[PDB]
Amino acid sequence: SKVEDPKDFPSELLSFLSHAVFSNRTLACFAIYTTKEKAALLYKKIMEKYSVTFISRHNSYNHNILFFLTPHRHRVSAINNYAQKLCTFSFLICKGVNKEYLMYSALTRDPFSVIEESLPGGLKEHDFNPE
Amino acid sequence: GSKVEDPKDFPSELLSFLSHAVFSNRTLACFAIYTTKEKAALLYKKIMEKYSVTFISRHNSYNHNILFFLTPHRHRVSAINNYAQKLCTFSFLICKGVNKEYLMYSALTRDPFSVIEESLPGGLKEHDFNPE
């Protein structure tokens, strides 16, 4: 497990991410990195639990990354709590997203791919703009 | 609110192939799990591996799923149940010893049930539950 499990997100994505998982500054864009089986499950649980404004599921080579935005702010430790406790096996990494567009956009391109998203045709740059 | 929504037991069509002593000290090598279609999917694999099942099958039961499996050594029912309760912690899950293995499995193949997938193709027959 020290041998098998990712210690973090793919490095291609760490610069779009917040690494202060134990902060108190709340965020409203989060990312979860985990196995494909757990990510399929969480796709729907996080959706229903957090009344997400948006959620998408992504190929990450062997695994999956979920990308989602909440209608209101939350602490990381909080989304980490809920996510870790739903299924208690395998690895899970859940971090804040600082660069919302940039994050979701890399997930739509090689080596990542979209498995599914709550909103047909997902997002674009303009969506992270004004109103 | 669980009480209103969750199955309190296996469907009644199969209650008599089952042991209803979940606190028993008797050990068994045939169990069944009643749970949501998604928990059951995870469990199909995680039960297989954890318990090195001789056989496992997964079945539609109306809107949920039933897991049927056989183990290479015996196991107290409480044991298998706890491993199942922990994994995923969210919906309903009923775990019971199976007393009448072949009837259980064979019912699980006829409507209102059906086989989603099984570890052995193409499933089990009467002769499989006989002597050698």
Numbering used by the authors:
A (entry chain B): 130 to 260
B (entry chain A): 129 to 260
Paper excerpt:
SV40 T-ag is a 708–amino acid protein containing at least three independent functional domains: an N-terminal J domain (amino acids 1–130), a central origin binding domain (obd) (amino acids 131–260), and a C-terminal helicase domain (amino acids 266–625). In the case of SV40, a single virally encoded initiator, large T-antigen (T-ag), can bind the SV40 origin, assemble as a set of two hexameric rings, and cause local distortions (ie, melting) of the DNA. The T-ag obd recognizes the GAGGC-containing duplex DNA at the origin and also binds double-stranded DNA (dsDNA) and ssDNA in a non–sequence-specific manner. In this paper we describe two crystal structures of the SV40 large T-ag obd: one in complex with duplex DNA and one as a dimer in the absence of DNA.
The second crystal structure we report is that of a T-ag obd dimer in the absence of DNA. This structure has been refined to 2.6-Å resolution. The asymmetric unit contains two T-ag obd molecules linked together by a disulfide bond. Although the presence of the disulfide bond is likely an artifact of crystallization, we include it here because it facilitates our description of structural changes associated with DNA binding. The monomers are related by a pseudo 2-fold symmetry axis with a rotation of 178° between the molecules. The dimer interface contains a mixture of hydrophobic and hydrophilic interactions and buries a surface area of approximately 740 Å2. The T-ag obd–obd interface is nearly symmetric with almost identical residues (18 total) from each monomer contributing atoms to the interaction surface. These residues are from helix αB (Glu166, Leu170, Lys173, and Lys174), residues at the end of helix αC, and residues from the B3 loop (amino acids 213–218). In addition, the cysteine residue bridging the two obds (Cys216) is completely conserved across the Polyoma virus family, and the C216G mutation in T-ag has been shown to be defective in unwinding closed circular DNA. The two obds from the DNA complex structure have the A1 loop in one orientation (flipped “down”), while the three obds crystallized in the absence of DNA have the A1 loop in another conformation (flipped “up”).
